[PDB]
Design a protein around this motif. Structure first.
Motif, PDB file in Angstrom:
ATOM      1  N   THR A 370       4.459  29.027  11.210  1.00 51.89           N
ATOM      2  CA  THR A 370       4.234  29.389  12.272  1.00 51.89           C
ATOM      3  C   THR A 370       6.286  29.503  12.580  1.00 51.89           C
ATOM      4  O   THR A 370       7.077  29.900  13.453  1.00 51.89           O
ATOM      5  CB  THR A 370       3.624  28.692  13.069  1.00 51.89           C
ATOM      6  OG1 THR A 370       2.500  28.818  12.770  1.00 51.89           O
ATOM      7  CG2 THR A 370       3.848  28.903  14.649  1.00 51.89           C
ATOM      8  N   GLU A 371       6.758  28.370  12.765  1.00 46.88           N
ATOM      9  CA  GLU A 371       7.764  28.121  12.439  1.00 46.88           C
ATOM     10  C   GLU A 371       8.314  29.334  12.260  1.00 46.88           C
ATOM     11  O   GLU A 371       9.921  29.386  12.423  1.00 46.88           O
ATOM     12  CB  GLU A 371       8.389  26.851  11.940  1.00 46.88           C
ATOM     13  CG  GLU A 371       8.139  25.507  12.821  1.00 46.88           C
ATOM     14  CD  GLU A 371       7.472  24.160  11.386  1.00 46.88           C
ATOM     15  OE1 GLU A 371       6.500  23.489  11.863  1.00 46.88           O
ATOM     16  OE2 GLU A 371       8.250  24.283  10.398  1.00 46.88           O
ATOM     17  N   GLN A 374       9.092  32.143  14.259  1.00 47.79           N
ATOM     18  CA  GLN A 374       9.631  32.203  14.551  1.00 47.79           C
ATOM     19  C   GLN A 374      10.794  32.021  15.279  1.00 47.79           C
ATOM     20  O   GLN A 374      12.115  32.657  16.027  1.00 47.79           O
ATOM     21  CB  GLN A 374       9.307  30.920  15.969  1.00 47.79           C
ATOM     22  CG  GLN A 374       9.774  30.280  16.437  1.00 47.79           C
ATOM     23  CD  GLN A 374       9.599  31.502  18.304  1.00 47.79           C
ATOM     24  OE1 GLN A 374       8.276  31.532  18.669  1.00 47.79           O
ATOM     25  NE2 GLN A 374      10.524  32.172  18.588  1.00 47.79           N
ATOM     26  N   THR A 377      11.814  35.740  14.108  1.00 43.96           N
ATOM     27  CA  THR A 377      11.305  36.502  16.011  1.00 43.96           C
ATOM     28  C   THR A 377      13.099  36.235  16.898  1.00 43.96           C
ATOM     29  O   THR A 377      13.139  37.114  16.927  1.00 43.96           O
ATOM     30  CB  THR A 377      10.509  35.788  17.149  1.00 43.96           C
ATOM     31  OG1 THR A 377       9.273  35.857  15.632  1.00 43.96           O
ATOM     32  CG2 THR A 377      10.070  36.294  17.885  1.00 43.96           C
ATOM     33  N   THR A 378      13.924  35.110  17.083  1.00 47.93           N
ATOM     34  CA  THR A 378      14.477  34.918  17.528  1.00 47.93           C
ATOM     35  C   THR A 378      15.846  35.740  16.968  1.00 47.93           C
ATOM     36  O   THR A 378      16.875  36.186  17.718  1.00 47.93           O
ATOM     37  CB  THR A 378      15.030  33.672  16.955  1.00 47.93           C
ATOM     38  OG1 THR A 378      13.513  33.124  18.228  1.00 47.93           O
ATOM     39  CG2 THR A 378      16.688  32.725  18.533  1.00 47.93           C
ATOM     40  N   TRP A 403      -5.855  28.359  14.966  1.00 43.59           N
ATOM     41  CA  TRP A 403      -5.355  27.833  16.135  1.00 43.59           C
ATOM     42  C   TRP A 403      -6.014  27.603  17.376  1.00 43.59           C
ATOM     43  O   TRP A 403      -5.947  26.901  18.369  1.00 43.59           O
ATOM     44  CB  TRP A 403      -4.197  29.636  16.517  1.00 43.59           C
ATOM     45  CG  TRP A 403      -5.357  30.484  17.294  1.00 43.59           C
ATOM     46  CD1 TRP A 403      -5.580  31.322  15.973  1.00 43.59           C
ATOM     47  CD2 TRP A 403      -6.057  30.611  18.536  1.00 43.59           C
ATOM     48  NE1 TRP A 403      -6.052  32.514  17.096  1.00 43.59           N
ATOM     49  CE2 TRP A 403      -6.562  32.266  18.352  1.00 43.59           C
ATOM     50  CE3 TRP A 403      -5.809  29.908  19.872  1.00 43.59           C
ATOM     51  CZ2 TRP A 403      -6.697  32.189  19.289  1.00 43.59           C
ATOM     52  CZ3 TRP A 403      -6.327  30.315  20.435  1.00 43.59           C
ATOM     53  CH2 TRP A 403      -7.039  31.983  20.844  1.00 43.59           C
ATOM     54  N   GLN A 408      -1.857  21.909  20.488  1.00 45.75           N
ATOM     55  CA  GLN A 408      -0.792  22.427  20.773  1.00 45.75           C
ATOM     56  C   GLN A 408      -1.147  23.736  20.472  1.00 45.75           C
ATOM     57  O   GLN A 408      -1.990  24.390  20.018  1.00 45.75           O
ATOM     58  CB  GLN A 408       0.719  22.380  19.970  1.00 45.75           C
ATOM     59  CG  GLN A 408       1.643  23.211  19.392  1.00 45.75           C
ATOM     60  CD  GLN A 408       2.873  22.955  18.997  1.00 45.75           C
ATOM     61  OE1 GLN A 408       2.862  21.482  18.279  1.00 45.75           O
ATOM     62  NE2 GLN A 408       3.415  23.232  18.532  1.00 45.75           N
ATOM     63  N   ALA A 409      -0.461  24.490  22.088  1.00 49.09           N
ATOM     64  CA  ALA A 409      -0.478  26.451  21.615  1.00 49.09           C
ATOM     65  C   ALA A 409       0.217  26.760  20.771  1.00 49.09           C
ATOM     66  O   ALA A 409       1.804  25.841  20.853  1.00 49.09           O
ATOM     67  CB  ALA A 409       0.013  26.105  23.520  1.00 49.09           C
ATOM     68  N   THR A 410       0.154  27.877  20.546  1.00 48.36           N
ATOM     69  CA  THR A 410       0.857  28.396  19.084  1.00 48.36           C
ATOM     70  C   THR A 410      -0.317  29.989  18.640  1.00 48.36           C
ATOM     71  O   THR A 410      -0.887  30.021  19.120  1.00 48.36           O
ATOM     72  CB  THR A 410       0.463  27.640  18.153  1.00 48.36           C
ATOM     73  OG1 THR A 410       1.029  27.754  16.752  1.00 48.36           O
ATOM     74  CG2 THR A 410      -0.871  27.547  17.160  1.00 48.36           C
ATOM     75  N   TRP A 411       1.295  30.554  18.642  1.00 48.56           N
ATOM     76  CA  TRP A 411       1.254  31.738  18.867  1.00 48.56           C
ATOM     77  C   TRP A 411       1.648  32.689  17.595  1.00 48.56           C
ATOM     78  O   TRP A 411       3.196  32.104  17.850  1.00 48.56           O
ATOM     79  CB  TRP A 411       1.093  32.765  20.384  1.00 48.56           C
ATOM     80  CG  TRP A 411       0.534  34.174  20.499  1.00 48.56           C
ATOM     81  CD1 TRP A 411      -0.393  34.323  20.291  1.00 48.56           C
ATOM     82  CD2 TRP A 411       1.650  35.054  20.468  1.00 48.56           C
ATOM     83  NE1 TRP A 411      -0.201  36.109  19.832  1.00 48.56           N
ATOM     84  CE2 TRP A 411       0.932  36.371  20.220  1.00 48.56           C
ATOM     85  CE3 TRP A 411       3.069  35.169  20.572  1.00 48.56           C
ATOM     86  CZ2 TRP A 411       1.282  37.503  20.689  1.00 48.56           C
ATOM     87  CZ3 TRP A 411       3.301  36.457  20.647  1.00 48.56           C
ATOM     88  CH2 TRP A 411       2.653  37.912  21.308  1.00 48.56           C
ATOM     89  N   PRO A 413       3.312  36.929  17.423  1.00 49.44           N
ATOM     90  CA  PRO A 413       3.220  38.280  17.662  1.00 49.44           C
ATOM     91  C   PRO A 413       2.763  39.591  16.559  1.00 49.44           C
ATOM     92  O   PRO A 413       2.168  38.708  15.109  1.00 49.44           O
ATOM     93  CB  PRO A 413       4.597  38.722  17.464  1.00 49.44           C
ATOM     94  CG  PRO A 413       5.450  37.599  16.913  1.00 49.44           C
ATOM     95  CD  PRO A 413       4.126  36.684  16.861  1.00 49.44           C
TER      96      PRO A 413
END
Ligand SMILES: Cc1c(C#N)cc(C(F)F)cc1Oc1c(C(F)(F)C(F)F)ncn(Cc2cc(F)c[nH]c2=O)c1=O
Lengths: 539, 404
Positions: A370-371, A374, A377-378, A403, A408-411, A413
């Motif tokens: 997930t990290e 992220q 994505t950035t 999830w 923790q809220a995690t997502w 795309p």
């Protein structure tokens, strides 16, 4: 030679501060002679002007001639003026990445000649740039000057030059929407999809518009031809790469040799897939001097050999096509290392990269993945203004299980599963309810703050008990030691009751990697069990 | 004509980084800003302006059109004396007591009032450039900007004149201005209430104001600490009951757990059934009547910041508490559903809106998410014209359990 008729940028000193009044140190006769010759030439060219005795400001001057040459350079120490000058806006937010360039038929480099000296300085600020060429042995009053243009080494020059070029280019940009112009320092990189003839015509028209504003550029004979070598990159007509990388073979590696090697490997990692630096980076941990020799561990030797093989054959990236999606694929490399590639058409990478597990964290591959998503994505929004579609080595069901249960809220795309082992999975799962016919261990851990001695143990519903003594420990370590005790002495199904929110929170997040020997010991036990239920009770 | 604005002494204007924006948001912003510059609302600026405030593009509540959202959080903190001490808009206690509260956007009113020339520099923002092709497009404001708390503070006298006939004709309607919105509360029947909202829209329309949305604060009843109703009780069940009651002992005065603690006498199997005594059942019933009532001794201190904590409970459910001193709850609630980030942004907006209605201020949020995950995506779902302060927390394993 020319100085732009562009409107000046109004400049101020920091509130409550006056201009510098730094005394000029006496100079040798050869240095004074050189400065007089340099300054007479700049005054002739309009760059500086002689000032009256009225001006109370002063910034020191020096003359440096390098022994290989017979040419003197004027050096002005603006340290005091810079400290008193207002803050300016940052020049650039980031740096252009080659992978973000769209392919052009023709591309031209126009570097502005004497960029700062071609831009006027605010008339009300000139007085603060006052400098003095001292007389022989400071016997008589010196020759005093002030700048009329942006001085070299002055705080405001890069921002004022940049905004001047922006204001100048603005009409040419409006009138030529299909011409790409990248602004970077003193350069303009100009590209178009016109036939070679009208590209040269458009370049001459741009150079002519710039000359109308005091900015000189190179003509056809002097302008660069591809491949362009820019900021550690090579820009060829249909591909880009990093500049040549030679990995030295040394008998003894110093901290400085290893830092240089790690920087080169990180730099190659934006287009060479699979580059690793974990083992080499571990060697740099500690209190070791630059020239101190660090022996390579077997693991760092293995990693260095793997990198040489990757870099043995040259690799290139393609340019960007804005009419297509970006695809990002990520692979797990082991021991917290992750590698990724971004392409639009498989498998012609625009760029590659890597992500590493956070230091001293209790973590798992789903969190690291997930990290990494992220981070990519950035980086993609910065380079292309859009997020890629991801191809991940994790089952939709493993992600869905993760999830939905995580606090923790995690997502992530838009993504699709891609079967590229090793796959990302969770290595154990805590039970939702207390297990029937399983032994309940009421574990306890405590440490005396004064002696640092601890005790870790359990009492069970079945009558079993244990207490173990620990030295130079903490409450946290004794409550993890108490959980580990119950895991070691229980069967395949176990209910464990603890007073530790700390231990509960670590284990609930299904870690499988930790920098703590004790957490790793607990992980080994949890994986082997068939059913573990963990409950919290107040002290 | 312009109102002179001073910063707090010792503090300088904002210098906040612009977060990366997608191509579509950048194109939306370039179009909006091109139009505002033609109208003289903003002007292009030079590099001698070292200030910056982030700018974003969001989708409106009323349409599928892009709107500019400027993050003035830092500028607001640095001008707190002006918009709060010098020109404070008082908060009406009656607003939360109304049957219906309608939220109207009045941000377009501010574009008619010019900003003090010496403060304009602090309103600087940058439109970023994809792959750093060009330097950012830099602008500053020439009029009262939307999102800045000094804007309603300055417009306050004009707003009073605009609202005077409506307020005089409808004495039992409460109109409260918070940032770019009006909160209009009444005790009228929903159709009579909507008719008054449309009548107030006509009043705003005469001053150029061409016009979340429909709240019912009287029907806001806090989510208490819920104790389960059970036929049979295992050891594990009583332990969770003690843990949840121990937590409310620190909050609610009079909570008792002596008789239930007595039931856990020994080291019994978690699955073992334990019969409830007359005393422990009475104690359980007494705690339920206390938990269903508001907390005795907890009052809003206007000199302290409000804090809002949110927990993800799974299955699209989220719980939240608003407090000033840890665990001394002013309000507790729940939000129900969309992905996790979408659900969480929606909960934040619902909680901030209730906070503006009850106290006239936004809470500082403790968000159960990764800083980078929130920072990348929150903008995709944001619909409010304000932004609350937020920080990132690692929800304690049992704060979730105590509020389930
Ligand atoms: C010259 C240069 C340099 C250098 N030195 C550095 C940068 C850096 F910003 F990335 C950009 C840059 O200009 C380029 C731009 C452009 F967009 F900037 C503008 F020219 F069109 N667009 C694409 N390429 C790649 C390219 C090379 C070529 F030989 C033929 N065809 C091509 O498409 C560029 O090199």
């Amino acid at each position: 030679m020319p100085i732009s008729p562009i409107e000046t940028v109004p400049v101020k000193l920091k509130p409550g501060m006056d201009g510098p009044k730094v005394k000029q140190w006496p100079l040798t006769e050869e240095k004074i002679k050189a400065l007089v010759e340099i300054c007479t030439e700049m005054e002739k060219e309009g760059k500086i002007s002689k000032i009256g005795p009225e001006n109370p400001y002063n910034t020191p001057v020096f003359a440096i001639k390098k022994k290989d040459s017979t040419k003197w350079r004027k050096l002005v120490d603006f340290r005091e003026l810079n400290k008193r000058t207002q803050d300016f806006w940052e020049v650039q937010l980031g740096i252009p990445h080659p992978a973000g360039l769209k392919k052009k038929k023709s591309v031209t480099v126009l570097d502005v000649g004497d960029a700062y000296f071609s831009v006027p300085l605010d008339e009300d600020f000139r007085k603060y740039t006052a400098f003095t060429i001292p007389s022989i042995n400071n016997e008589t009053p010196g020759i005093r000057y002030q700048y009329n243009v942006l001085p070299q080494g002055w705080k405001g020059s890069p921002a004022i030059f940049q905004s001047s070029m922006t204001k100048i280019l603005e009409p040419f940009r409006k009138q030529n929407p299909d011409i790409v112009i990248y602004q970077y320092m003193d350069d303009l990189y100009v590209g178009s999809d016109l036939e070679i003839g009208q590209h040269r015509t458009k370049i001459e028209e741009l150079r002519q518009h710039l000359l109308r504003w005091g900015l000189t550029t190179p003509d056809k004979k002097h302008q660069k031809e591809p491949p362009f070598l820019w900021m550690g990159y090579e820009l060829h007509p249909d591909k880009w790469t990093v500049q040549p990388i030679v990995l030295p073979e040394k008998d003894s590696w110093t901290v400085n040799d290893i830092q240089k090697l790690v920087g080169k490997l990180n730099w190659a990692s934006q287009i060479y897939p699979g580059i690793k630096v974990r083992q080499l980076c571990k060697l740099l941990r500690g209190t070791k001097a630059l020239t101190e020799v660090i022996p390579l561990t077997e693991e760092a030797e293995l990693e260095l050999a793997e990198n040489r093989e990757i870099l043995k054959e040259p690799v290139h990236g393609v340019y960007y096509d804005p009419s297509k999606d970006l695809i990002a694929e990520i692979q797990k490399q082991g021991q917290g290392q992750w590698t990724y590639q971004i392409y639009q058409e498989p498998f012609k990478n625009l760029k590659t990269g890597k992500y590493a597990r956070m230091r001293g964290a209790h973590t798992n591959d789903v969190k690291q993945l997930t990290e990494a998503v992220q981070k990519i994505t950035t980086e993609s929004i910065v380079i292309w203004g859009k997020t890629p579609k991801f191809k991940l080595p994790i089952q939709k069901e493993t992600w869905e299980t993760w999830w939905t249960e995580y606090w923790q809220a995690t997502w992530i795309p838009e993504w699709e599963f891609v079967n590229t082992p090793p796959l990302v999975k969770l290595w154990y799962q805590l039970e939702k309810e207390p297990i029937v016919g399983a032994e309940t261990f009421y574990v306890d851990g405590a440490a005396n703050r004064e002696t640092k001695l601890g005790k870790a143990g359990y009492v069970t519903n079945r009558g079993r008990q244990k207490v173990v003594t620990l030295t130079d420990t903490t409450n946290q370590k004794t409550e993890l030691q108490a959980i580990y005790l119950a895991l070691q002495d229980s069967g395949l199904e176990v209910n464990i009751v603890t007073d530790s929110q700390y231990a509960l929170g670590i284990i609930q997040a299904q870690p499988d990697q930790s920098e703590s020997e004790l957490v790793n010991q607990i992980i080994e036990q949890l994986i082997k069990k068939e059913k573990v239920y963990l409950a919290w009770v107040p002290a």
